[PDB]
């Protein structure tokens, strides 16, 4: 019961995740982190970029109008 977010994994891998636009982008960190790595994408350091607007995993992905046509770079740090 959610949409298909779209992100850009620094490595150049353009893909998309299956979280809800209303979520706080953290649930997303759970997925993307599970897809890339709990070291290179640990929900903790999990953050995204939409139009230069970083998005801490504890913020709303929808707050950054993250559409499927566009993507948000998934930046993280250990």
């Amino acid at each position: 019961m959610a949409v298909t977010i779209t992100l850009k994994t620094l490595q150049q891998q353009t893909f998309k995740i299956r979280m809800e636009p209303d979520e706080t982008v953290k649930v997303l960190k759970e997925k993307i982190e599970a897809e890339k790595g709990r070291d290179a994408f640990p929900v903790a350091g999990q953050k995204l970029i939409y139009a230069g607007k970083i998005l801490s995993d504890d913020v709303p992905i929808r707050d950054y109008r993250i559409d499927e046509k566009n993507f948000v770079v998934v930046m993280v740090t250990k």
């Binding site: 620094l10 150049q12 993280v76």
Partner: protein, 32 residues
């Protein structure tokens, strides 16, 4: 090494994901 869809930044993560992140974070927000 990690051509199987796995970067890891060989331990650069923060700087490599912040550097890489920004570079592609601007997918389109600076007329170019």
């Amino acid at each position: 090494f990690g051509r199987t869809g796995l970067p890891d930044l060989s331990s650069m993560t923060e700087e490599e994901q912040i550097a890489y992140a920004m570079q592609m974070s601007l997918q389109g927000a600076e007329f170019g």
